[PDB]
């Protein structure tokens, strides 16, 4: 998955966004975030050494 | 109760049919009575003091 950093209002936080690509993760993030009046700050890939 | 009935029998004390509800001065306060008022229901005979 991908952790998308969303920031709005008085504070910020990260939400999981599942996708097959970083770019796709960004698109799926924005499409599922921006229109609500939420800003999309950052997108990070999930590491987790296994 | 039995013990109380024994007590009544020995000391010959009539158990009153009337409980004492009387208004008494609250504990700790010592005043001087400066006045008394008696309010009587309309139709009920006034007492002596009243």
């Amino acid at each position: 998955k991908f952790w998308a950093t969303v920031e709005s209002s008085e504070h910020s936080f990260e939400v999981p966004i599942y996708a097959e690509t970083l770019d796709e993760a960004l698109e799926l993030a924005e499409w599922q975030y921006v229109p609500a009046g939420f800003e999309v700050t950052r997108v990070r890939p999930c590491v987790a050494p296994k | 109760t039995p013990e109380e009935k024994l007590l009544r029998a020995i000391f010959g004390e009539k158990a009153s049919d009337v409980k004492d509800s009387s208004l008494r001065v609250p504990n700790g306060v010592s005043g001087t009575v400066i006045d008394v008022q008696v309010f009587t229901r309309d139709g009920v005979e006034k007492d002596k003091r009243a």
């Binding site: 008085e10 504070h11 | 139709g43």
Partner: protein, 521 residues
């Protein structure tokens, strides 16, 4: 075309939503704890709130009855006709049952024998004790004429028997019991029929096609049994194994033909006919009610605030409407509307009179209170303030001292959870003291007094202690009568009564008496 934006949009336009509504619509990728619990914070930063079918049955009932088509002036006559056709059919079905007549005759034998009253056996026939005593003999006569015709000429007299039995209006309870008896008898018939059936098809291996072939029309005789099994059929020779059971259980089957005075063929027909009639009746009557369901609401809208819910009112009123449909006859020409109105209103009022109170009071009490409430209206501004408490009932037809009590119990109790002053969590019932409790001080003094009295009783003689304990409930259950004391004490009567007075004296002196003296506060 966003899920989140839809959630937030609902939560913006409305502004204001509940946890569940937010849980309903969530991002495809958010199912878990920190993924919601934080989204709430997100939402509770802007447009902040946290906490078809509209539920409340006031709607659903209104719609469901909103479906039903209103009747027509002529349609009422159609439905009522269906009713008449329906009922009297089951009445005739009752009249054609021998045990139904014999039961009536026997119960009347119990009436004249003073083992029961008339009110329980009859409401009157088409209408006096003498007239009853005779008409009943008419019934009995038409019975005793048809009883001897059991030999093709009987079908003629059975008609008249039905006629005279029909002329009786039975007490509803009795009629119900009759119908019940009939259907139960039918259930017995089915018991034997099914028992015999399962011993052939379900066990003995034989088709229901062949089984019912020789069954219908006899079922009592051995024509289908002793004259059958030898037929050389695949299902024939298999019938030898159970042949005992069926033949043993057949006795009751032919016994029913005696008890009821009808062949097994006839019974089923009569009771089935009755079932058809009953079903027809209820089928029309329900249809009558459903059309008039609106009237009930229209009436109930008057009685709203009397302490019963809207739907309670409309339901009790619905029951009233049902009663109206049950007791109505179109042949009287009375308009069903203005008729049923009074019934519905009656059910409503009678119900409110009952269940709207925490402490339920009799009807005449409610009425008596009402009259006082009405009298207190006219003298309100007439007396310049309000009529004196002892001037109301003067106009009433009663001793007038009731006004107090009547005005007392009538007041409904105050909710124990009623918020008291300070507007805090302090509630009325929180300030209710427990009087019924025995304070610990007194409970200790009682123990000390027990020990004390015990000690004082340890000082007397063994027999004095025994008799003084026996006279009272001291350290024993059920204090004994002065004679019983002697019964346990051998020597009896005036003896014991003396020792008592002898004990009290010894315990009267300020040596033994000084210890428990202070308990006399």
């Amino acid at each position: 075309q966003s899920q989140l934006k839809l959630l937030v949009t609902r939560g913006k336009e409305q502004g204001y939503l509940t946890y569940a509504e937010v849980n309903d619509h969530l991002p495809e990728d958010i199912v878990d704890s920190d993924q919601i619990e934080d989204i709430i914070q997100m939402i509770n930063d802007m447009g902040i709130q946290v906490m078809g079918r509209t539920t409340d049955p006031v709607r659903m009932y209104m719609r469901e009855m909103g479906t039903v088509e209103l009747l027509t002036r002529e349609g009422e006559i159609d439905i009522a006709k269906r009713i008449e056709d329906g009922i009297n059919q089951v009445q005739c079905s009752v009249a054609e049952y021998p045990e139904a007549i014999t039961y009536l005759l026997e119960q009347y034998d119990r009436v004249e024998a003073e083992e029961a009253r008339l009110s329980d056996l009859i409401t009157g026939f088409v209408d006096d004790p003498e007239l009853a005593r005779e008409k009943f003999a008419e019934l009995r006569a038409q019975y005793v004429v048809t009883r001897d015709t059991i030999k093709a000429t009987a079908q003629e007299e059975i008609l008249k028997l039905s006629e005279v039995f029909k002329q009786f209006r039975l007490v509803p309870k009795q009629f119900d019991y009759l119908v019940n008896s009939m259907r139960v008898m039918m259930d017995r018939v089915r018991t034997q029929e099914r028992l015999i059936m399962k011993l052939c098809v379900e066990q003995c291996k034989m088709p229901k096609k062949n089984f019912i072939t020789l069954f219908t029309g006899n079922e009592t005789s051995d024509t289908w049994f002793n004259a059958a099994i030898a037929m050389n059929k695949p299902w024939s020779e298999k019938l030898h194994d159970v042949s005992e059971e069926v033949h043993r259980a057949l006795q009751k089957l032919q016994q029913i033909e005696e008890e009821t005075g009808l062949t097994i063929e006839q019974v089923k027909d009569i009771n089935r006919r009755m079932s058809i009639g009953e079903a027809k009746a209820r089928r029309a009557k329900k249809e009558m009610v459903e059309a008039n369901l609106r009237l009930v609401i229209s009436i109930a809208k008057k009685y709203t605030n009397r302490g019963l819910q809207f739907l309670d009112l409309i339901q009790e009123g619905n029951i009233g409407l049902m009663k109206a449909v049950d007791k109505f006859e179109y042949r009287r020409g009375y308009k069903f509307s203005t008729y049923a109105t009074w019934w519905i209103r009656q059910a409503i009022t009678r119900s409110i009179a009952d269940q709207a109170r925490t402490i339920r009071i009799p009807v005449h009490m409610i009425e008596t209170i009402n009259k006082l409430n009405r009298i207190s209206r006219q003298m309100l501004q007439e007396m310049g303030r309000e009529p004196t408490p002892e001037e109301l009932a003067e106009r009433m037809l009663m001793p007038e001292d009731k006004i107090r009590k009547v005005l007392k119990i009538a007041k409904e109790p105050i909710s124990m959870e009623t918020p008291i002053g300070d507007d805090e969590d302090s509630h009325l019932g929180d300030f209710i003291e427990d009087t019924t409790l025995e304070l610990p001080l007194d409970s200790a003094t009682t123990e000390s007094l027990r020990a004390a009295t015990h000690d004082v009783l340890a000082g007397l003689t063994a027999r004095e202690a025994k008799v003084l304990r026996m006279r009272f409930g001291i350290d024993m259950n059920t204090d004994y009568t002065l004679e019983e004391v002697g019964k346990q004490f051998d020597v009896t009567r005036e003896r014991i009564r003396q020792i008592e007075a002898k004990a009290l004296r010894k315990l009267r002196h300020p040596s033994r008496s000084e210890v428990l003296r202070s308990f006399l506060d």
